[PDB]
């Protein structure tokens, strides 16, 4: 079995997040790697952006990323990438023709990639598996255009792979999806890498990151886009410092795009610290060093940062939003905040910072919790999904 995965607008090889690179990228790369271990051949197609990488990147046995040239290597933001839909498809058509390579099935990620895959599937007479990841309908002409396309994929993909059950409800409610085509594939997290793990480990991480050993630490991890709520953490942190101006707290925010600006405006620059985005082998230390990981997302999806925080033995305080309620066992492995007000987040941060015994236990419980996912697990579900799709064509 050879699968073509399509990831048009962002490459699995991009440092997540910064950029347009986040959970979706690591979802695609992690599932792909596990599929490849299981004997399944995966080619992940993405738009070429870094010519030093070459056309074909051999990632591991059975795993390749294909950088397809379509428009300049730069000066094209996500919003304009629709203009490259036909060219990127054509890119894949040449590549496959040139390399004489045939696929059993296509698995597209995000609506741009799906539009590509819908054309390819009729042409190649193979099935399309589509994963939305995020949806317009969950108010501009550009979003109505995107919705309309998301609507097309819903009506045409052979299988709609969603990441949670709540996402399946969304497909059914907002997109009139036929439930017989939706299929829940519950995601994973690299649970061997992200891990507590050793009794000296937190304080080793702290030495390594230059954090003082005796202080409480809250961490934000991920893209510094406003829908991710880092502003909420900074605002909440400021609130805590009005209540008690010498609270023993430091914040590390990690990593990529100003918020430092908001933090000076609010008088808290000295206790906040912005870490550059880094690869997973190095993010572990951020998680380990943190007492609490705050994930104040406005939109979401399926909660990957929450999962890795948990895996690594650190309780999470998340927004009641997207996948987070499922990624976090409210009251057992962390807290869920309603809304994004600074007052509410200060309260929730205060209750875990001041109650040592509770927080220490949430952390331990989270490890057991996070072990319910499992990229391997995720691949095994996709494995079956694929087999069925092929079986039924």
How far apart CA 353 and CA 294 sit, in angstroms, is: 12
77, interface contact from Mg ion, ligand UDP, its own copies, none, CB < 5-8 Å by kind: its own copies
User: Is 28 one of the binding residues for ligand UDP (CB under 6 A)?
Assistant: no
The residue from 127, 188, 222, 315 that contacts ligand UDP (CB under 6 A) is 222
How far apart CA 310 and CA 228 sit, in angstroms, is: 18
Distances (CA, A) of 245 to 22, 147, 238, 242, 267: 35, 47, 9, 6, 11
Within 269-288, the residues that bind ligand UDP by CB under 6 A are: 277-278, 280, 283
* Residue 49 annotated in ligand binding: no
Helix H or strand E encompassing 383: helix 375-391
Q: Which residues bind Mg ion (CB under 5 A)?
A: 288, 290, 314
Q: How far is the CB of 283 from its own copies (least distance, A)?
A: 32
* Crossing angle of the two packed helices 356-370 and 304-311, in degrees rounded to 10: 110
Q: Concatenate the DSSP letters of all residues of 207-238 into one string.
A: HHHT--SSSEEEEEES---GGG-HHHHHHHHH
314, interface contact from ligand UDP, its own copies, Mg ion, none, CB < 5-8 Å by kind: Mg ion
How far apart CA 234 and CA 240 sit, in angstroms, is: 10
In the bound state with its own copies, the residue whose beta carbon lies nearer, of 55 and 282, is 55
The residue from 2, 51, 53, 145 that contacts its own copies (CB under 8 A) is 145
Q: Is the dihedral of CA 230, 236, 237, 238 positive or negative?
A: positive
How far apart CA 96 and CA 94 sit, in angstroms, is: 6
Helix H or strand E encompassing 13: none
In the bound state with its own copies, the residue whose beta carbon lies nearer, of 118 and 302, is 118
Within 287-306, the residues that bind ligand UDP by CB under 6 A are: 300-301, 304-305
User: Given the rule CB under 6 A, which of 21-29, 79-87, 312-320, 364-372 is the region that contacts ligand UDP?
Assistant: 21-29
* Residue 265 annotated in ligand binding: no
Q: Write out the residues near ligand UDP by the rule CB under 6 A.
A: 16-17, 22-24, 26, 221-223, 254-255, 277-278, 280, 283, 300-301, 304-305, 308
Q: Write out the residues near its own copies by the rule CB under 8 A.
A: 71-72, 75-77, 79-80, 82-87, 89-90, 93-94, 115-116, 118-119, 122-123, 141-142, 144-146, 148-149, 152
């Amino acid at each position: 079995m050879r699968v073509a995965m399509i990831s048009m607008h962002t490459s699995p090889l991009q440092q997540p997040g910064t950029g347009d690179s986040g959970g979706m990228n690591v979802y695609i790369l992690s599932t792909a790697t596990e599929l490849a271990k299981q004997g399944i051949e995966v080619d992940i197609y993405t738009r070429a952006t870094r010519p030093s990488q070459g056309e074909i990147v051999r990632v591991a046995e059975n795993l390749r990323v294909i950088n397809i040239a379509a428009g300049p290597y730069e000066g094209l933001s996500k919003e304009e990438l629709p203009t490259q839909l036909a060219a990127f498809t054509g890119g894949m058509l040449s590549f496959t023709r040139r390399e004489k390579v045939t696929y059993d099935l296509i698995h597209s990620h995000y609506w741009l990639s799906g539009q590509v895959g819908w054309l390819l599937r009729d042409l190649w007479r193979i099935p399309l598996i589509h994963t939305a990841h995020t949806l317009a309908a969950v108010d501009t002409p550009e979003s109505e255009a995107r919705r309309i396309c998301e609507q097309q994929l819903v009506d045409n993909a052979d299988v709609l792979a969603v990441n949670t059950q709540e996402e399946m409800q969304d497909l059914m409610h907002h997109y009139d999806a036929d439930p017989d085509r939706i299929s829940v594939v519950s995601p994973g997290a690299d649970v061997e890498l992200y891990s507590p793990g050793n009794d000296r480990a937190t304080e080793r991480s702290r030495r390594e990151l230059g954090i003082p050993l005796h202080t409480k630490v809250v961490a934000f991890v991920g893209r510094l886009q406003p829908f991710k709520g880092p502003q909420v953490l900074i605002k909440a942190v400021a609130a805590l410092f009005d209540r008690d101006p010498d609270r023993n707290l430091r914040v590390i925010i990690c990593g990529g795009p100003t918020y430092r600006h908001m933090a000076e405006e609010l008088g808290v620059e000295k206790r906040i610290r912005f870490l550059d985005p880094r690869p997973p082998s190095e993010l572990v230390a951020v998680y380990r060093a943190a007492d609490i990981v705050a994930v104040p997302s406005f939109n979401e999806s399926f909660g990957l940062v929450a999962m890795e925080a948990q895996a690594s033995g650190t309780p999470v305080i998340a927004a009641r939003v997207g996948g987070l309620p499922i990624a976090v066992a409210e009251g057992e492995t962390g807290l869920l905040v309603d809304g994004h007000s600074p007052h509410a987040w200060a309260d929730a941060l205060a209750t875990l910072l001041d109650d040592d015994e509770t927080r220490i236990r949430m952390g331990e419980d989270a490890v057991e919790h996070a072990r319910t996912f499992s990229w391997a697990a995720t691949a095994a579900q996709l494995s079956s999904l694929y087999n069925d799709a092929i079986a039924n064509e």
